[PDB]
A = this chain, B = another copy of it.
Amino acid sequence: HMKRIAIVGAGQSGLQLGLGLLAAGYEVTMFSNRTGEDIRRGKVMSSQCMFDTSLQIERDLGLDHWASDCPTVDGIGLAVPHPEQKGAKVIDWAARLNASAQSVDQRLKIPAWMDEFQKKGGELVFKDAGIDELEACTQSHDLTLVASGKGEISKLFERDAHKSPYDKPQRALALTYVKGMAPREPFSAVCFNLIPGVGEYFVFPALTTTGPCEIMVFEGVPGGPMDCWADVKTPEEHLARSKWILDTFTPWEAERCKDIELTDDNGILAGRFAPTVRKPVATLPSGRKVLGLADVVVLNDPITGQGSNNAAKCADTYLKSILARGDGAADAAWMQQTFDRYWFGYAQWVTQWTNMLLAPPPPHVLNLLGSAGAVPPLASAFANGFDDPRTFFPWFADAAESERYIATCAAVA
Contacts and interface: CB of A to CB of B under 8 A. Distances in A.
A408 B395 CA distance: 30
Contacts of A413: 333
A90 interface: no
Interface string A370-391: 0000001100110010001011
A335 interface: yes
Residue among A52, A336, A348, A395 with most chain B CB within 10 A: A336
A319 to B, nearest CB: 13
A31 B344 CA distance: 40
Given A324-B99, A412-B332, A344 B377 contact: no
Interface string A94-112: 0000110000000000000
A409 interface: yes
Say how many copies of this protein the assembly contains: 2
A412 B381 contact: no
Interface string A345-357: 1101000000000
B412 A377 contact: no
A97 to B, nearest CB: 9
A332 B412 CA distance: 5
A35 interface: no
Given A341-B384, A344-B391, A393-B344, A336 B409 contact: yes
A337 interface: yes
A281 B384 CA distance: 20
A32 interface: no
Contact of A333 (B162, B344, B376): B376
A304 interface: no
Interface in A308-360: 321, 324-325, 331-333, 335-337, 340-341, 344-346, 348
A340 B381 contact: yes
Interface string A388-413: 10111101000000001000110111
B393 A321 contact: no
A333 B391 CA distance: 16
A390 B348 CA distance: 10
26 contacts: A98-B321, A98-B324, A99-B324, A162-B404, A333-B377, A333-B380, A333-B409, A333-B412, A335-B412, A336-B377, A336-B408, A336-B411, A336-B412, A337-B380, A337-B384, A341-B388, A341-B391, A344-B390, A344-B392, A344-B393, A344-B395, A345-B388, A345-B390, A345-B391, A348-B393, A390-B390
Interface of A: 52, 98-99, 162, 281, 321, 324-325, 331-333, 335-337, 340-341, 344-346, 348, 376-377, 380-381, 384, 388, 390-393, 395, 404, 408-409, 411-413
Pairs of residues from A and B, 6 with the lowest C-beta to C-beta distance, nearest first? A332-B412, A344-B391, A336-B412, A333-B377, A98-B324, A333-B412
